[PDB]
Amino acid sequence: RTRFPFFSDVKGDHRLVLAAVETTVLVLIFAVSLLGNVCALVLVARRRRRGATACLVLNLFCADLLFISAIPLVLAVRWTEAWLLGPVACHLLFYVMTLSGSVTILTLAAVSLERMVCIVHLQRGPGRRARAVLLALIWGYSAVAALPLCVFFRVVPQRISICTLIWPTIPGEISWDVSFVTLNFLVPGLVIVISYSKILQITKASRKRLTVSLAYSESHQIRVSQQDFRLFRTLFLLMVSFFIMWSPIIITILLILIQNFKQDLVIWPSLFFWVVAFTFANSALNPILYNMTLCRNE
Amino acid sequence: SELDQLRQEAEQLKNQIRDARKACADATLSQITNNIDPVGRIQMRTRRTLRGHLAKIYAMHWGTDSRLLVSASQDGKLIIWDSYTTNKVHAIPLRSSWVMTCAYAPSGNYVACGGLDNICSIYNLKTREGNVRVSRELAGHTGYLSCCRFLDDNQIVTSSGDTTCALWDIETGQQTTTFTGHTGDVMSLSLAPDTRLFVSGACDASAKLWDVREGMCRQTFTGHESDINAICFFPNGNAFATGSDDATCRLFDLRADQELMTYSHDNIICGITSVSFSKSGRLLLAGYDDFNCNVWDALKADRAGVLAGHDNRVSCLGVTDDGMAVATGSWDSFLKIWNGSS
Amino acid sequence: TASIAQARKLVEQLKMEANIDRIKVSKAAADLMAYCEAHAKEDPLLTPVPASENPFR
Amino acid sequence: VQLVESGGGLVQPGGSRKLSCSASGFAFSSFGMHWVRQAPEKGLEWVAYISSGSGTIYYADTVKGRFTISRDDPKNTLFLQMTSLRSEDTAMYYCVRSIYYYGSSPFDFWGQGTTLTVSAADIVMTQATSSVPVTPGESVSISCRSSKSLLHSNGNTYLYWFLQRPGQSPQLLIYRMSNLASGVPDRFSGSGSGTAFTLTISRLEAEDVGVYYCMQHLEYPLTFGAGTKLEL
Ligand SMILES: CC/C=C/C/C=C/C/C=C/C/C=C\C/C=C\C/C=C/CCC(=O)O
């Protein structure tokens, strides 16, 4: 019953060096993410205070700011290795982290459906309260979804203790995990890809109608279509960054699932810590992606 | 040669007045005022932001009380605000959305708006029925109304893009006097504190002193390289300041018949939109096209403060009668009240 | 024909404008100096009023 | 401007009666409306108030809960339905205007009034009856006192002076202790210092006879004065 030593590498090599490296990559991530978020949130508040179209991007900006609120406890535990903090203090970390993660992925997929709904359907003419009802649901569905990671969670001693997951019912555990994977990482990725495929096909159709219906010249199309790659690169980067940044946590979840039966598959808790650091770094460039064209590094 | 002889006589007369202006220039104001202490940094905080318009604001006018201000935006709404409590006393729906000017009667009983409709409409705020209604639409102008200002509750002087300004008797609705002489759209009009004379700024880059009673121009002031977009009288009424699209403001004197100082900087290349002096005539505030609003010390031409609170073109600017506040209105539908903090 | 009338109006306008006894700039700027330096104790932006008497507090 | 009222008369005790206030001649949808009543051979007393658009509603604690007030702005009619009428609610009920912006004059036009004949803490204002045998050409000062300082921090002094001719509805003389109402002669004047206010008439004519009332307006529980009557 080795369970899993979440963030508890009992026997590290050169821990002096290893622990220092983890703490440093972590405080830098905290700094960049917090600075970018406090800049972007106040900028978007100023923009919306001027009567800008109600948006959901500020929900992402606060969700990923809440995401970096649990890393202080994370690197506090990274030194101790054993989770000295009390179970009630220990519950909070795993619960909030997986409430922000499932409120970030879901708002990134809601921002991209609001944008392919306006730039395509509601061109210029959608209730703020309708968007508000979706927004509150997102925060709610996310908290409820990761509630099983708070109830079926309890610290247990080894040798000296670890905050693993009890999960009495194995079929129930795997059912909840697959329903969380297919409803918090699969369909959001699908809707994001579908939406950003539309904002493209519609843009390409508009450009082609410009060049074949108004009888433009080939030299002219290239003096007007100087942004087609600029927009393409931007939205393809959005989709691929989302996928390549939120995939490591899901594949680690699946491999610790198959550890549930494949105990022979020795896996490194250090790998779990590294993918968690990568998911934390996800919150560091979410302001960068959604405020890219606004400021290109001044 | 028939037209050539008297047209020559005309340029001879203008050369004569040029050398007369030059001869009387004993000294420049800059050297005369070089011995006075500088105002220094002026910090103004936005005490109130008057949100409520849904379109670019083109004009604002403070009431004599220094608490009520009228604002006109192209949303077709003229709103009278309570500056102290940021409340909307009235929101008059304008018949035409295109409004380029707004006025508040000296008594406060009436307000007026004008624009591309080519008509100046007077609204009676104090009515028994309890609603604000148009009392008189003054319609005898060919070009768009640029600025309209009230001398009394029966007399209003209006400036238009037909290159003419006119004095109107509100009761009859007819122009008692028509002021002609500008060769370009008149964009701005400021009356003397005594309301006996008014100065008009036009796109022909000249400002002319006019007298309401005599009916015609007394003096013409030149020196701007571009259209005068804004004009304001000095508190004494012996001077006025003109803002143009060449990013320069100039202080003219009605007795020296020439300019005195020029307010310009190489960092600013955006034309002025609205200017107004302080109560004591020491602070010449000017709204610029670059979202900013400089505070020029009108005695040494030294920029002594910037009011950066807008994100679009600052279009209107006005200091209260007691001089205790400054309200700027830009193209982002927001007014802002500013005053010095000690 | 019509332009000569407005030219005549212009020349009499300039004639009546030229017959003005202008004062020197030294006398003119002295009055402006007196006006600026004599009304500075009452101006609320050149010399700000304390917040106790400020109604925009 | 015209505010006519209908309904009201002989009501058996413990019953109910609805009173209608039909407003014609002004923008009824933008006027806060009050109901004021005056007991026979007695001074006025506030009853209820409904804001524009029925956003805010207040009642006097004497009649709170028993009375209801509602407006129908599409037809320009204000309503007051009373339930369980006792023997103390017998009074002439007035339907008054009121509009509140900066510089506005509340209680501009009072209604005609309907007689109600039911059969079988707060700020108090004190003024003596003072039936002065005045003569045309006399300068008279009418003083009323308040239990609290009427002067608010913003600068206003919410004191209102009303005049009621014999057999006629009250009108507004001075609002906020210094501002003359539009329509009354200039001879009326008023002043005060937070307490112990006074109303001064310089050129008293034969028309300025009746009962003078003073009213506070800081807090919505409102209270008039006893009423100073001028004769001869
Ligand atoms: C998008 C969701 C959020 C992303 C960021 C999450 C960070 C915190 C990680 C939480 C992982 C939680 C559960 C993983 C799956 C189940 C654990 C079971 C495996 C252990 C072996 C066993 O079953 O005995």
Numbering used by the authors:
A (entry chain R): 22 to 146, 150 to 183, 191 to 329
B (entry chain B): 2 to 343
C (entry chain G): 6 to 62
D (entry chain N): 2 to 121, 137 to 248
Passage from the reporting paper:
Free fatty acid receptors 1 to 4 (FFA1 to FFA4) are class A G protein–coupled receptors (GPCRs). However, FFA1 and FFA4 are activated by long-chain fatty acids, while FFA2 and FFA3 respond to short-chain fatty acids generated by intestinal microbiota. FFA1, FFA2, and FFA4 are potential drug targets for metabolic and inflammatory conditions. Here, we determined the active structures of FFA1 and FFA4 bound to docosahexaenoic acid, FFA4 bound to the synthetic agonist TUG-891, and butyrate-bound FFA2, each complexed with an engineered heterotrimeric Gq protein (miniGq), by cryo–electron microscopy.
The N-terminal region of FFA4 preceding TM1 folds inside the TMD and directly interacts with the ligands, resulting in almost complete shielding of the ligand-binding pocket from the extracellular milieu. Our structure revealed that the ω-3 unsaturated chain of DHA adopts an “L-shape” binding pose, which enables it to penetrate deeply into a binding pocket that is rich in aromatic residues. The carboxylate head group of DHA, on the other hand, extends outward toward the extracellular milieu. The six carbon-carbon double bonds in DHA are surrounded by, and potentially form, extensive π-π interactions with aromatic residues F27N, F882.53, F1153.29, W198ECL2, W2075.38, F2115.42, W2776.48, and F3037.35 [superscripts represent Ballesteros-Weinstein numbering (41)]. Hydrophobic residues I2806.51, I2846.55, I2876.58, and L2886.59 lining one side of TM6 form additional hydrophobic interactions with DHA to further stabilize lipid binding. We conclude that the binding of DHA to FFA4 is mainly driven by hydrophobic and π-π interactions. Nevertheless, the overall binding pocket of DHA exhibits a negatively charged potential, which may help to position the carboxylate group of DHA at the extracellular surface. In the active structure of FFA4-DHA, the long chain of DHA reaches this motif and causes rearrangements of the three residues. The movement of F2746.44 and W2776.48 breaks the continuous helical structure of TM6 of FFA4, resulting in an outward displacement of the cytoplasmic segment of TM6, a hallmark of GPCR activation. In the structure of FFA4-miniGq with DHA, residues Y247ICL3 and R254ICL3 of FFA4 form hydrogen bonds with the carbonyl groups of the mini-Gαq residues C211 and T202 backbone, respectively, while H251ICL3 of FFA4 forms a hydrogen bond with D199 of mini-Gαq.
